[PDB]
Amino acid sequence: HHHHHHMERASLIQKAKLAEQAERYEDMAAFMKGAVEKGEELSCEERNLLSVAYKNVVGGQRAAWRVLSSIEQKSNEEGSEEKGPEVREYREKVETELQGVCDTVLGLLDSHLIKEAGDAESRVFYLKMKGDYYRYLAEVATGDDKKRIIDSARSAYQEAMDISKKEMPPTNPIRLGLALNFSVFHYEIANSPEEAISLAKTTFDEAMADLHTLSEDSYKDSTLIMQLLRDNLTLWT
């Protein structure tokens, strides 16, 4: 007997939708976290609520971390030690909150969503998200710890790649976004620029060749991501 448990899931989902309208993304993520923890799979729309909520939370933290790390680097070039300790301390604080959010997302993926994922679109979506959030840890880690995170991310992305190559057309936006993010992983994190350019080129070309087969809506989703694949390629070449 689970009616009260179903109605709680539905209340959380609804409050997440409200938090999204209100642009209150920390709340949105807490609500979606609760909904995931009720046990059921997520619909396509629920997957996107989950993704949008945590993408905003961790996006604000990464932009913050990048700004502070930029300041801290220039401060270990001048000897400017008078305002020295505070930049380091505050960078480390933001960094720890960033890592906590990624751990939360990774906990949801590995404990609930990846294993209970019905179809193939869903497995690719969650596996890609797993790679992304390890990638976000990798942006702040150093040394051998960074190299272990890289291994987990590469491993999640490669498995999403294998499923997407067999199950989805080259123009599918989830496949395209996965390949884009994997290619960003190769150049900015795993220092595999050749693999990044080769992956971004192949993904762009194979999508380009099928664009004439798409509806107007499919075509707009696919080409928006193709412009990012090419802008990256411009920057990497």
Partner: peptide, 8 residues
């Protein structure tokens, strides 16, 4: 960052 990932 000039590099871009997937906006979702």
């Amino acid at each position: 960052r000039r590099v871009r990932s997937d906006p979702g």
